[PDB]
Amino acid sequence: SRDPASDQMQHWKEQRAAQKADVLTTGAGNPVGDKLNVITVGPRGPLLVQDVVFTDEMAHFDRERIPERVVHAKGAGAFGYFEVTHDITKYSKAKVFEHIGKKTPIAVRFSTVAGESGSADTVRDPRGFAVKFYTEDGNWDLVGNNTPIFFIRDPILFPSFIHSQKRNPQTHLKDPDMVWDFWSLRPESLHQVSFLFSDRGIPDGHRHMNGYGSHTFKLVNANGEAVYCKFHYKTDQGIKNLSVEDAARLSQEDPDYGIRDLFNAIATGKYPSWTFYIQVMTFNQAETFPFNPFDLTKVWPHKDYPLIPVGKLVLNRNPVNYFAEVEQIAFDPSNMPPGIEASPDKMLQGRLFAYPDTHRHRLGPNYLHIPVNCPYRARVANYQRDGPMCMQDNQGGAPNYYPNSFGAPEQQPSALEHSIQYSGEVRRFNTANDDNVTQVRAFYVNVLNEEQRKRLCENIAGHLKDAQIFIQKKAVKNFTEVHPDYGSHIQALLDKYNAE
Template sequence: MILTTNNRLTTSWGAPVGDNQNSMTAGSKGPTLIQDVHLLEKLAHFNRERVPERVVHAKGAGAHGYFEVTNDVTKYTKAKFLSEVGKRTPIFVRFSTVAGENGSADSVRDPRGFAVKFYTEVGNYDLVGNNTPVFFIRDAIKFPDFIHTQKRHPKTHLKNPNAVWDFWSLSPESLHQVTILMSDRGIPATYRHMHGFGSHTFKWVNDNGDGVWVKYHFKTEQGIKNLTEELGTKIAGENPDYHTEDLFNSIEKGDYPAWKLYVQIMPMEDADTYRFDPFDVTKVWSQKDYPLIEVGRMVLDRNPENYFAEVEQATFSPGTLVPGIDVSPDKMLQGRLFAYHDAHRYRVGANHQALPINRARNEVRNYQRDGQMRFDNNGGGSVYYEPNSFNGPTETADNKPASFTVSGMADSVSFDHNDHYTQAGDLYRLLCEEERTRLVKNIVGAMMPVENEEIKLRQIGHFYKADPEYGICVAEGLGLQIPQKVR
């Protein structure tokens, strides 16, 4: 059998390999010789095949597709990929669980990450959200502590419900998200059967420089479907990759999942007078006040060819923006603008943006050079600093972010609005009786292992303040009484 050049096994530096079945030894019984550089290279590369997993959102699945504009929104934003009805933009989407490790089960009670990368003609735009419209906390300074409570105890290496409920009971702003998480929506049936949200408030700016505040809503066309706690646990034991498998198989057989994108638009001046802080990510805007406006349709129609290259190495950040879309003063968002890019530089490398899955479709021109894993021509011999006299790339003033007014004393301050109960109570009352029964059952089951009664009573107090029935039902389920001071 004669091998062609294309079929020859080579080392990573391209030299042909003579024997890939037997290591080089001193005689048939060894020992192994260190001069077997092919063996050393194989073992060394194998040791490094896993990049550090994401601190959060470690377990996930992804797919390629397109986004098509279905409604004219140019009066709100100059973003080019939204510039005309019918315009299509290629996308890559990654869905994920939040707290679990890379090998954890898909069907656990946990929020789901919902990250979309738009490959626009003027650079990539990342919309990095969840399948819930709110979050547990509203200030990024609390994020490391919150995530620590979701991870394993440093001594037992077991999940720690004491830490989870201790943190939540001491952080009443979490109540809205906790109610969603413990409801039927806490375990989506599949990635295809859940909505997605940008969660944060962002800013859109039009060609005239006029801005509006915006929230994103992806509505699944497959319909909402959820799993009960019992079924989710059963699937976790039988097929822990259930959601990953479902997404891949549905696309493979041509059953392409789709979502409609809507936005809520708030005039800039309303932010000063709205009854909830519009930049508080633990709150929603009423759709009666700011109705949903259709923007477009997202379709996933192609599976990755290689999971590691396209899903594991995909990097998203809410700071990956394009002209026409900007950020808001949301304190959680402000922290994420740093943390996400920094996590990718640590996990994947300083040049993660140059990897094929992350690379912009338009030409990238800047003065960044060198760094680990620089695999293109590194700018060649072109000018590598700015300003310069050699016709290097320069800024374009019309793409400068719109200015905005800031004022106030520099200090570590809390939010002005601290009503953590109204929206959580509204959500509880919106549920039907069967849904409320399951919500309470899920909460009681999750809180039962908590050893400290004070933590339980503190959390029950939050439920009671949201709705007395809510608190009483949880207390009864745990065999406790509502504290008199709460009543």
Template sequence: MTKDKKLTTSWGAPVGDNQNSITAGSRGPTLIQDVHLLEKLAHFNRERVPERVVHAKGAGAHGYFEVTNDVTKYTKAKFLSAVGKRTPLFVRFSTVAGENGSADSVRDPRGFAVKFYTEDGNYDLVGNNTPVFFIRDAIKFPDFIHTQKRHPQTHLKNPNAVWDFWSLSPESLHQVTILMSDRGIPATYRHMHGFGSHTFKWVNEDGDGVWIKYHFKTEQGIKNLTEEVGTRIAGENPDYHTEDLFNAIENGDFPAWKVYVQIMPLEDADSYRFDPFDVTKTWSQKDYPLVEVGRMVLDKNPENYFAEVEQATFSPGTLVPGIDVSPDKMLQGRLFAYADAHRYRVGANHNALPINRPKNEVNNYQRDGQMRFDHNGGGSTYYEPNSLNGPSESPEDKQAGFPVTGVAESVSYDHNDHYTQAGDLYRLLSKDERKRLVKNIVGAMEPVESEEIKLRQIGHFYKADPEYGTRIAEGLGLKVPAEVK
């Protein structure tokens, strides 16, 4: 029987024997001249890039976005320019705190990252399955994530750190309530909503702007797992969500989401009852109703997990003309942190990899760096400005400006009401949903060793809703601190 393809080394030479190392006789030591062996072992040692600091465990799929409503009066983004227009995309779903080998069905937010391959370059929307986040300033992010990771001595998860941080960061209460509710463990990646979470700015052809928030509404319906079922599945099939997404697409059951935005006039940002750039808060849909934009469909599985899912890189700073950022302090930090993480983890040329490479032509003066695997600009002009007809700027594509005022100093947000929205959410829950919420929180707080931490957190729950705090206190065998009543 003949073989169609010869096994080769990475430099293309045919391999004569892939079963036996070259040795000095049948029992002699292995010879260093066996360059095929050396290459295999050296490459094997380097097969794992560092895992993501957060969102390490995930699954991905290809698909498309189709515009279903005319939004050109709000944005000049070309991929949103006409009803019926389709744009290819890649999506990565993930858990946040766990390592690459952790279980899918744990209580954790889910990452919801979308890469649109538009004709004006890639556009990344890097969000979660929740509309808010735990903190609102990026300077607190490393500390927050440290609490979600392992204790440096015991190498175990540390509920003392988790609840100490949250109890000292009352802005986290809204997201904590969501996390500990039924929504904390989605049944699958297909049965959850997605959100851009941050406030962004859309700008139209005339330079007029609006503030917007993204909402992806699952067409499969919302389904969640109880704590008990999630724990059981984590033991039986830790890759449950990864497997479900792959099998659904493989079987032609393509998951889809309707995409909407909330739209706020620029001037409303100065008068709205919550700071619209505070990612720990939502905008009421009564004030700013959902406006339909399009539909996202996932219809193709990756051919290779590492090449596509693991090497996919997303950053909220990957923008296209017509979509700008806002003064959201958490977003401002992510503009640097995400792209920098990819430069460290995958390399300075990560955007040249097939999964990240834009569909349109790339023209710039960036050269060299590790793993530069294209023609590296050849002999073309490598600086700018130049008089040699090299790529030049297009003033019409500048980001729209906005006025800024104030003193340069370290300041907090002006609005510090961290309890109203969390309390409203609690009161929206049904009787059974509240019961499960309280049970989940009590179970998560019981291992905390410090009574002071427990009482401090109980105070936050009580300020959101007296019943909320009282039931947590009773579940922990404590009393609500008198000073918060």
């Protein structure tokens, strides 16, 4: 008996117990007489087309791969439930929050951002923490990160940001000039860059990190009154990080450390959990907040906006087939039930488009039919039909146009969205020069202690040293604007590296 992950096949065999092996078939259910040799013209002659067993198997092997996710390609998944522990029905009418003790099944995927499918788990990166709630009002996807903020505040920069974090288009190598050119030109990134290069840049697996919705969302109650909120889901296992040295070692010894850790925890009954909270901001408070409350590079200070407990997330079930339940899972931030809505955060608005769009490419037009993606606790009834790999009844003979006089599905006025008046011209507004430094200073001065500040600067200088000097200079200038000691410490370390 090794760890449960290592004993996967042995356990499968034992579960089968006395049962005879199934008969090996083709995809069309025809039994296979021999699957160890192909049909040839005599023992040393050529292969025949009529070996359809061979072609059937090989053609399917040839088509096994699908495009990886454009970001967050490397991941781990699990299933469990969300349980309401407190009443927030004064803020939201969403059915997922309807009453204390209400349990909703969930699916979760954890990931890194930049690495491809075959990359190591224990690298410095933000972590994805996506949660799908299968509610009676349809799926709610809260597609969070292990950070409350992000590097940029306008979505039209997101492809550029990702490109700068991935491989050089010619050499196919990671490129420090690209990374730091972009970040030095876009100092809105300082806040998340400070988080990334701190100790929480490398969590000790997925169970020891927090998640955040990051964006401001809108909650709407039964009386049609709205507030703004933030979602926080805090680890009940405690924050725990890997040192740079342990992370580097594990990246070679166990590239799949995060997958293995989660699988073994759940398989041995150590079910990880998170406490789910909201922060709430009224429309009036949004008018007077000193920054843009919809700016993704900003947090809401806890003193002014305390955490309000809502419930807990528990993961208690491993995937049975990774490809089916983790590779093919799709989260769309636009999947929000009545009672939860988007705010004007420009980044969130961009995400409302991007996710269904990429899913139609990565998975296919009918990706919502895939079992893990199905809103299986709701009844889907609409006027959508057809498309490739339509795997359901395609809504049978129901009338396929709306409005109609034949009793087909009808809109539900109670589900109408919340209306707001907005003031201004319709145009492109520059946000590059919003406050880039104030909350970063609070982090550097008040949240980090002295050891942490030192590791932060060493982590930064270790990466920034590989960029050209003109880039190093612009970057240090930005850190100086945060705090003269931040910049000067980094510059000192760079001097040492550049001397070598």
